[PDB]
Amino acid sequence: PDREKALELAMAQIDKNFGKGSVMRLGEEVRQPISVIPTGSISLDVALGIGGLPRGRVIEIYGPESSGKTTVALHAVANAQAAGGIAAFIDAEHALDPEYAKKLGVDTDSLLVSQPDTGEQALEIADMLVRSGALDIIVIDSVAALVPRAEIEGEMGDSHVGLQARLMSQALRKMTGALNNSGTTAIFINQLEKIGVMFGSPETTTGGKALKFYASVRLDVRRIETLKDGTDAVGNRTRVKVVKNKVSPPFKQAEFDILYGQGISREGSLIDMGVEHGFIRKSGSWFTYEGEQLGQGKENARKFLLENTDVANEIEKKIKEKLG
Numbered sequence: 001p002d003r004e005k006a007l008e009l010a011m012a013q014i015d016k017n018f019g020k021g022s023v024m025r026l027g028e029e030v031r032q033p034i035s036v037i038p039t040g041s042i043s044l045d046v047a048l049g050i051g052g053l054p055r056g057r058v059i060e061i062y063g064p065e066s067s068g069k070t071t072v073a074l075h076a077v078a079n080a081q082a083a084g085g086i087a088a089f090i091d092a093e094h095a096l097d098p099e100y101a102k103k104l105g106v107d108t109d110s111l112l113v114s115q116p117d118t119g120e121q122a123l124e125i126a127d128m129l130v131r132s133g134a135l136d137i138i139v140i141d142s143v144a145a146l147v148p149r150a151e152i153e154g155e156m157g158d159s160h161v162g163l164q165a166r167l168m169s170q171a172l173r174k175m176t177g178a179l180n181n182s183g184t185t186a187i188f189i190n191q192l193e194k195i196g197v198m199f200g201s202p203e204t205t206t207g208g209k210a211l212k213f214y215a216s217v218r219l220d221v222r223r224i225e226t227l228k229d230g231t232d233a234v235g236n237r238t239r240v241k242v243v244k245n246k247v248s249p250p251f252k253q254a255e256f257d258i259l260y261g262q263g264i265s266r267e268g269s270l271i272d273m274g275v276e277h278g279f280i281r282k283s284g285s286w287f288t289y290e291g292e293q294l295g296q297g298k299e300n301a302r303k304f305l306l307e308n309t310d311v312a313n314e315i316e317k318k319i320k321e322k323l324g
């Protein structure tokens, strides 16, 4: 190439008129911002390209029940709180469980939680609550539970059936500018492909029409396998694919563990992530760390870092220092 002449000038024009990262090649290591929100999984973190979800942008997390969406949502939230941040939770499902949130790192006490009466409301609240500039993150549990005021009151609206896609489009449009000027990232939980499921692949094509286009990031969270511990069902392994990422190349895979009541294993995430990058060395079942050993079985290894917090932070570091 010299072909690379006009092309690079072009792409400059694309990012010029249409948003920022409108065009890029799968193989890049983009700018890397200073403000991000770690997901709780370094694995996912790196797949997002920027070690956290983007700020001031809308984010769609979708997949089947019992996948890992809320957990992820709740972790992503526990952190906006560590850096002194205010988080809001718009609840249309009435299925949030504090004892679990808290167990993950979420200050439930200071966690704002609305319980909308119509979807048209839920969004109004979520908006004029955003136009504040006080919230760092806001989670909308269930995109489908936001029923229009007309379908819920039996009848009292316009342009009949197929309206809640309008309420979304018309609202998402307002939150866009609202979020792009306040630095509030929002997570929309979308309940219900994931490659490796099979049997068909559902019915009538939307990852939320509007949401599909508004979303800057879109996670495809699917449960890939339920875990064990020679005892029972400790948790399960989750697979997240980033089908959309306007902050860095998309289509990146991220896999991690989630344990009932515990959440995402940072430790277990560090091992499988530190070895693949030569930081950790498996041999004879010993996940030894440069000279000194960690544990016999990966579980016992998960536990080691769990006890040796100091050495675990040193691994998380080296890895994020090797890439981003």
Ligand SMILES: Nc1ncnc2c1ncn2[C@@H]1O[C@H](COP(=O)(O)OP(=O)(O)O)[C@@H](O)[C@H]1O
Binding pocket: 064, 065, 066, 067, 068, 069, 070, 071, 072, 097, 100, 235, 236, 258, 259, 260, 261, 262
């Ligand atoms: N109250 C809870 N107690 C124990 N584990 C829980 C609890 N809530 C969620 N989980 C864990 O999260 C997984 C499902 O994720 P979320 O609960 O993220 O569902 P979605 O995946 O959002 O339906 C479950 O398999 C379980 O391991």
